[PDB]
């Protein structure tokens, strides 16, 4: 039952560079391999098939090679279009048709420190019994950042959730939202609410706070 | 010339009723259709192989491509023959079509020699009795003669109206795709995609491009065929249709169109004529069966005709109105009483 | 203006006749006329054409482990049929995996062969032909040729002479009401009307032009069950009616029409049909007529007939002494319906003696002839020739 | 040549039978492709081939699902269809219909645009929108950040636009997070010239189809550091 392994998991590169991706089957599938492109939120797009043939209208910079169990996808000179997740598929012995887990072709760039904003709860929300305080880390790179909520200089825990955008198509940056939710009573107890942001592009952490 | 219209296609195997020896087979020279539309007698024959191309789609007048099992193969144009009752003369060749002139016969045969130099042939019932241009059933073509209308198949290898369609072929069953590795079945695919189905629980049916081994099953519980064809072929009456409403991936034009041309015939030598009142007497040398006809030029024409075989005397009544006498391909003779 | 002379000559090509012009007080004149060509062209109106058919038969749909279904198509002689219990073999083994439970869809239809553009017969209605005439007139030193329509209306001017020919005395036509035309042969055939084509007979395929993509088809195309193990589409069908006719059609009209008609195609026409007779009107201007004031006063009036034979050939000779009044012309004619002369209009000058030819139908003649202003009676007898057949009437 | 479009319920409860329709455009079913098929993708994971309907009528199913999967062709409506019985939360995924027109091989070259299908016994709550007002503590020279919070909804798909599509640049709509209550919540933010806060109307257009809830929200500057 064919098992497909792609490599590397993440390949973060800059445009114009040559990119190489690897696919390996658990057993010989001859050259019966295909490579699909999938951009975030879209359908997979067929790039290569039978391990070397190029689909209709696919740019000539894409090319596939290999046989037996070991296969290579190569993009000659990356374009901004080309940054997406690439899967490999087997048909050498099916059903079941099986895929790989993908390779994420991230766009490398220089460091960008987030612009940090803090939003206190809505009054319209507070008529209803709970408080949500949100913190916006906007247009930063690299992806990892740390958010700490402090309430009157008390580090919080277990009461905030966060979410990061896709790598921006024109910007190759990331942004995240961190939401601190808890009861209206607890919000009305305290005064100072602080979002503390730590990131590679910050020489030392920044803090955005408000007074209730 | 540029008959790259065959590049995406291939020849094929099809039912032949007499592959020699009074036995039918699956032939690479199956005949599809014999045409006899040209009044000059030329036959325009369609076969299952393709003439004038290598297996690489390159044109070569000395080569001929047929199918050896699943694989198209090259062979010698020089070995191609059409035979009827007695050997024919091939006037033209293009892909699936052969222009030949044939003697009178009741069967028509086409064959060729493969790479291994085996004769392959195919034979069909075909009454070939090409009716006569003119009024003289002649046997040697003359110089000194009269020219008459007729139709021919010209030797244009190019760009006509008439077309045949080429489709995706159906899957090709092949028992040799499977062998009994004792207790199990081994499907050996060579370099092809095989669609298979076995009637044994566990790994029942699917596709494979690799040598696959199906466990605990006998070979007469499995069906295997070659699929994922990537060359087109004529949707012959002798081949299954791959899908219900068929398929189509291209068209191929039918060369050698019927054109309307002129043919020479002889004129039988002028007969010796002697005269009496109301009477004409004629000696006739037919060099070959020559038609003689005559009519009165009055109200009652009284048409008479006969084919004169060998030298003959004819006595004819010349009425008051006169007599017209057509002797073969000559212009009519006219006689009146004095 | 000038002067009509009206004559009726029989409708025989190649036999000349002379007519006698008496414009009172002017030159007593003789003119020669010979039909060269009597062309008769029917007004054609095509019903249809016919040719070989082509039975178009695709690959049969062999449904393995299932049943195929026919879908009616609007095609000529569209025949579809699904045979069951089939187990066919291709080269590599059996096509189907089921033993019973298999079906074959056989379908076919009929359309025109491509050859219909080149090998085809035409079925026309032939309507009353328009007569035409090529005619030689010998006229005061002129062999002239006129090409009028023999309807009695088309006037033609040649050397300042009016000609009106026709209408023909005969309605006769070698062409029936409906004709069939093939490459230069015409046939009288009661061909079936369009849409009434006959399986295996002339017109099993009917089409309005060689160019139509519509055709009528009636061939009894019947699909038959394929043989055991065989992938093929066997069928029964009536073999082409166009072939059967081209191989059975028999003698055409060029060889069988009466009156010695010569039949041609493109256009269809009958030629030199020796049937009936034909009138001619010649309006001669004054210039040809010179008053008898200039005609010779004939003294020295004597004849002789040295030798004659009754053949329809160049067959008579005669001698005359004459006396004239000045230098000029004069014509020659006779009163005998059985005897004639091809010498027509000759020398009259001074006072002289000459000789002319003639031809006679009788082997013994008591005849009365006239020249210029006087007649004379003569006689002759002919010894039969050592020949028996001639080559004009 | 052809276009595939999925058609599905979106929210299915456990043990019921998910039923999807892939409608085909620009060509009839029986002539337009050599394989039709269904392929799913759970959130944050790769692709899984569910099944394929061959043009010959053969159906090839994934062995781990064959007991629950049916794929059929309705040629009377040009659509093929998937029925997955006895559904659990693992079946929650974006489902794609796909086809292979060009070779008869077993790849996929035409794709639909997949439909999210969520599997739970929760019951489709509509959202609540609250403004994230541009505050007095972040307008230091040139750009303000504002937005909306869409809170307490189910199931996942929610559409957020700004000024009815007039405002696109600089908008980040974050992926929704799932709260302890079993309800989703996401925020959508836009950065704008601070020089235009009192003169440009900014409206969120939130659109939660499963609850048929479309809401417009006007976001206005702050008061708890402002004089009434």
Short mmCIF file of C-alpha atoms in Angstrom, two decimals, chain B residues 92-319:
data_model
loop_
_atom_site.label_atom_id
_atom_site.label_comp_id
_atom_site.label_asym_id
_atom_site.label_seq_id
_atom_site.Cartn_x
_atom_site.Cartn_y
_atom_site.Cartn_z
CA UNK B 92 0.34 3.96 -55.15
CA UNK B 93 0.73 3.76 -51.39
CA UNK B 94 -0.04 6.10 -48.48
CA UNK B 95 -0.59 5.02 -44.89
CA UNK B 96 -3.61 2.74 -44.88
CA UNK B 97 -4.32 2.96 -48.63
CA UNK B 98 -3.00 1.07 -51.67
CA UNK B 99 -3.70 1.86 -55.32
CA UNK B 100 -3.44 -1.35 -57.35
CA UNK B 101 -4.39 -2.61 -60.80
CA UNK B 102 -5.52 -6.22 -60.66
CA UNK B 103 -6.51 -8.97 -63.10
CA UNK B 104 -10.02 -10.36 -63.09
CA UNK B 105 -10.57 -12.34 -59.92
CA UNK B 106 -12.92 -13.30 -57.13
CA UNK B 107 -10.64 -12.93 -54.10
CA UNK B 108 -8.36 -10.02 -53.23
CA UNK B 109 -5.28 -10.54 -51.08
CA UNK B 110 -2.84 -8.13 -49.42
CA UNK B 111 0.30 -9.20 -47.59
CA UNK B 112 3.71 -8.10 -46.41
CA UNK B 113 6.92 -9.38 -44.84
CA UNK B 114 7.66 -8.48 -41.22
CA UNK B 115 11.08 -7.90 -39.63
CA UNK B 116 11.50 -11.62 -38.86
CA UNK B 117 10.69 -12.23 -42.55
CA UNK B 118 7.40 -14.02 -42.03
CA UNK B 119 4.73 -13.65 -44.70
CA UNK B 120 1.51 -12.13 -43.37
CA UNK B 121 -1.50 -12.08 -45.68
CA UNK B 122 -5.21 -11.35 -45.67
CA UNK B 123 -7.85 -12.29 -48.23
CA UNK B 124 -11.42 -11.18 -48.92
CA UNK B 125 -14.12 -12.16 -51.41
CA UNK B 126 -13.99 -9.59 -54.19
CA UNK B 127 -15.55 -9.96 -57.65
CA UNK B 128 -13.25 -7.88 -59.89
CA UNK B 129 -14.57 -7.70 -63.46
CA UNK B 130 -13.77 -4.13 -64.48
CA UNK B 131 -16.26 -3.26 -67.21
CA UNK B 132 -15.09 -2.12 -70.59
CA UNK B 133 -14.27 1.43 -71.65
CA UNK B 134 -15.28 1.64 -75.30
CA UNK B 135 -16.73 -0.91 -77.71
CA UNK B 136 -13.72 -3.25 -77.94
CA UNK B 137 -12.81 -5.76 -75.21
CA UNK B 138 -9.10 -5.35 -75.86
CA UNK B 139 -6.15 -7.01 -74.12
CA UNK B 140 -3.10 -4.96 -75.20
CA UNK B 141 -3.17 -1.20 -74.75
CA UNK B 142 -2.53 0.54 -78.10
CA UNK B 143 -0.87 3.70 -79.31
CA UNK B 144 -3.01 4.36 -82.39
CA UNK B 145 -6.50 4.67 -80.96
CA UNK B 146 -9.34 6.89 -79.82
CA UNK B 147 -9.56 8.52 -76.41
CA UNK B 148 -12.70 8.22 -74.28
CA UNK B 149 -13.93 9.42 -70.88
CA UNK B 150 -13.05 7.41 -67.78
CA UNK B 151 -12.27 7.98 -64.11
CA UNK B 152 -9.09 7.26 -62.16
CA UNK B 153 -7.55 7.43 -58.71
CA UNK B 154 -4.78 10.04 -59.05
CA UNK B 155 -1.58 9.74 -57.01
CA UNK B 156 -2.03 12.89 -54.89
CA UNK B 157 -0.82 12.18 -51.36
CA UNK B 158 -2.38 15.35 -49.98
CA UNK B 159 -5.23 17.28 -48.51
CA UNK B 160 -8.54 15.90 -49.77
CA UNK B 161 -12.09 16.14 -48.44
CA UNK B 162 -12.82 12.52 -47.52
CA UNK B 163 -11.74 11.57 -44.02
CA UNK B 164 -11.48 8.65 -41.62
CA UNK B 165 -11.49 9.23 -37.87
CA UNK B 166 -8.83 8.10 -35.38
CA UNK B 167 -9.86 7.50 -31.76
CA UNK B 168 -8.50 6.33 -28.45
CA UNK B 169 -8.13 2.54 -28.83
CA UNK B 170 -9.87 0.22 -26.36
CA UNK B 171 -7.94 -1.64 -23.68
CA UNK B 172 -5.96 -4.55 -25.12
CA UNK B 173 -6.52 -7.94 -23.44
CA UNK B 174 -3.37 -10.03 -23.23
CA UNK B 175 -3.23 -13.33 -21.34
CA UNK B 176 0.59 -13.33 -21.35
CA UNK B 177 0.47 -10.32 -19.02
CA UNK B 178 -0.21 -12.93 -16.32
CA UNK B 179 1.68 -16.01 -15.14
CA UNK B 180 1.22 -18.52 -12.32
CA UNK B 181 4.04 -18.11 -9.86
CA UNK B 182 2.82 -21.25 -8.13
CA UNK B 183 -0.08 -20.42 -5.84
CA UNK B 184 -0.24 -16.78 -6.96
CA UNK B 185 -0.53 -14.61 -10.07
CA UNK B 186 2.32 -12.43 -11.32
CA UNK B 187 1.27 -9.58 -13.61
CA UNK B 188 4.25 -8.50 -15.73
CA UNK B 189 3.51 -5.12 -17.28
CA UNK B 190 6.67 -4.55 -19.34
CA UNK B 191 6.63 -0.78 -19.75
CA UNK B 192 2.86 -0.29 -19.84
CA UNK B 193 -0.18 0.42 -17.68
CA UNK B 194 -2.25 -2.69 -16.97
CA UNK B 195 -5.89 -2.62 -15.91
CA UNK B 196 -6.61 -5.88 -14.09
CA UNK B 197 -9.41 -7.62 -12.20
CA UNK B 198 -9.06 -10.90 -10.27
CA UNK B 199 -11.96 -12.91 -8.87
CA UNK B 200 -10.41 -13.67 -5.50
CA UNK B 201 -10.94 -11.86 -2.20
CA UNK B 202 -8.13 -9.44 -1.47
CA UNK B 203 -6.54 -7.18 -4.11
CA UNK B 204 -9.39 -7.71 -6.55
CA UNK B 205 -9.13 -5.05 -9.28
CA UNK B 206 -7.11 -1.97 -10.12
CA UNK B 207 -4.31 -0.47 -12.20
CA UNK B 208 -0.57 -1.06 -12.15
CA UNK B 209 2.51 0.16 -13.99
CA UNK B 210 4.85 -2.15 -12.05
CA UNK B 211 5.16 -5.91 -11.91
CA UNK B 212 2.52 -6.79 -9.33
CA UNK B 213 1.92 -10.09 -7.54
CA UNK B 214 -1.65 -10.98 -6.57
CA UNK B 215 -1.75 -13.51 -3.76
CA UNK B 216 -3.59 -16.83 -3.54
CA UNK B 217 -5.32 -16.72 -6.91
CA UNK B 218 -5.19 -18.70 -10.15
CA UNK B 219 -4.58 -17.18 -13.57
CA UNK B 220 -7.97 -18.22 -14.93
CA UNK B 221 -9.51 -16.04 -12.22
CA UNK B 222 -7.91 -12.85 -13.60
CA UNK B 223 -8.42 -10.51 -16.54
CA UNK B 224 -5.62 -8.19 -17.64
CA UNK B 225 -5.42 -5.57 -20.37
CA UNK B 226 -3.10 -2.79 -21.49
CA UNK B 227 -4.64 0.65 -21.01
CA UNK B 228 -3.58 4.32 -21.06
CA UNK B 229 -2.80 4.21 -24.77
CA UNK B 230 -1.15 7.34 -26.12
CA UNK B 231 -1.47 6.84 -29.90
CA UNK B 232 -4.64 7.00 -31.97
CA UNK B 233 -6.16 4.47 -34.34
CA UNK B 234 -8.99 4.13 -36.85
CA UNK B 235 -12.33 3.15 -35.30
CA UNK B 236 -12.51 0.03 -37.43
CA UNK B 237 -15.67 -2.09 -37.60
CA UNK B 238 -13.36 -4.92 -36.49
CA UNK B 239 -12.21 -3.26 -33.24
CA UNK B 240 -14.28 -2.55 -30.09
CA UNK B 241 -15.28 1.01 -29.26
CA UNK B 242 -13.49 2.28 -26.17
CA UNK B 243 -16.51 4.21 -24.83
CA UNK B 244 -20.26 4.12 -25.49
CA UNK B 245 -20.44 7.30 -27.58
CA UNK B 246 -17.02 6.52 -28.97
CA UNK B 247 -14.04 8.82 -28.79
CA UNK B 248 -12.17 10.95 -31.28
CA UNK B 249 -8.69 12.41 -31.27
CA UNK B 250 -8.09 13.20 -34.93
CA UNK B 251 -8.83 12.68 -38.60
CA UNK B 252 -6.84 11.33 -41.56
CA UNK B 253 -7.62 12.25 -45.15
CA UNK B 254 -8.20 9.61 -47.81
CA UNK B 255 -5.58 10.08 -50.56
CA UNK B 256 -5.87 9.35 -54.26
CA UNK B 257 -9.13 11.17 -55.02
CA UNK B 258 -11.35 10.12 -57.90
CA UNK B 259 -10.55 12.39 -60.85
CA UNK B 260 -12.15 12.38 -64.27
CA UNK B 261 -9.65 11.63 -67.05
CA UNK B 262 -9.21 10.09 -70.49
CA UNK B 263 -8.38 6.51 -71.55
CA UNK B 264 -7.14 5.19 -74.91
CA UNK B 265 -8.88 2.37 -76.80
CA UNK B 266 -8.16 0.90 -80.23
CA UNK B 267 -10.29 1.19 -83.34
CA UNK B 268 -11.02 -2.10 -85.10
CA UNK B 269 -9.58 -2.13 -88.60
CA UNK B 270 -11.90 -0.90 -91.33
CA UNK B 271 -14.03 -3.80 -92.63
CA UNK B 272 -13.99 -4.88 -96.25
CA UNK B 273 -17.22 -3.74 -97.90
CA UNK B 274 -18.99 -5.08 -100.99
CA UNK B 275 -22.35 -3.90 -102.29
CA UNK B 276 -25.53 -5.19 -103.89
CA UNK B 277 -28.91 -3.56 -104.35
CA UNK B 278 -30.49 -3.15 -100.91
CA UNK B 279 -27.59 -5.08 -99.41
CA UNK B 280 -24.10 -4.57 -97.94
CA UNK B 281 -21.61 -7.35 -97.14
CA UNK B 282 -18.79 -6.79 -94.66
CA UNK B 283 -15.73 -8.77 -93.65
CA UNK B 284 -14.61 -8.06 -90.09
CA UNK B 285 -11.22 -8.66 -88.48
CA UNK B 286 -11.67 -8.34 -84.72
CA UNK B 287 -8.23 -8.40 -83.15
CA UNK B 288 -10.34 -8.86 -79.96
CA UNK B 289 -14.12 -8.91 -79.24
CA UNK B 290 -15.50 -5.94 -81.16
CA UNK B 291 -19.08 -4.71 -80.85
CA UNK B 292 -21.07 -4.35 -84.07
CA UNK B 293 -24.36 -2.46 -84.11
CA UNK B 294 -26.66 -1.11 -86.78
CA UNK B 295 -29.91 0.79 -87.17
CA UNK B 296 -32.21 1.92 -89.93
CA UNK B 297 -32.35 5.68 -90.43
CA UNK B 298 -36.11 5.74 -91.02
CA UNK B 299 -39.01 5.64 -88.60
CA UNK B 300 -38.33 2.07 -87.44
CA UNK B 301 -34.65 1.97 -86.40
CA UNK B 302 -34.58 -1.76 -85.53
CA UNK B 303 -31.47 -1.68 -83.37
CA UNK B 304 -29.29 -4.78 -83.67
CA UNK B 305 -25.96 -5.51 -82.01
CA UNK B 306 -23.60 -8.42 -81.49
CA UNK B 307 -20.07 -8.95 -80.22
CA UNK B 308 -17.84 -10.20 -83.04
CA UNK B 309 -15.29 -12.64 -81.61
CA UNK B 310 -13.14 -13.71 -84.58
CA UNK B 311 -13.04 -12.99 -88.31
CA UNK B 312 -16.54 -12.90 -89.72
CA UNK B 313 -18.77 -12.08 -92.70
CA UNK B 314 -21.94 -10.04 -92.16
CA UNK B 315 -24.78 -9.52 -94.66
CA UNK B 316 -26.98 -6.48 -93.98
CA UNK B 317 -30.17 -5.24 -95.63
CA UNK B 318 -29.95 -1.62 -96.77
CA UNK B 319 -33.52 -0.21 -96.78
#
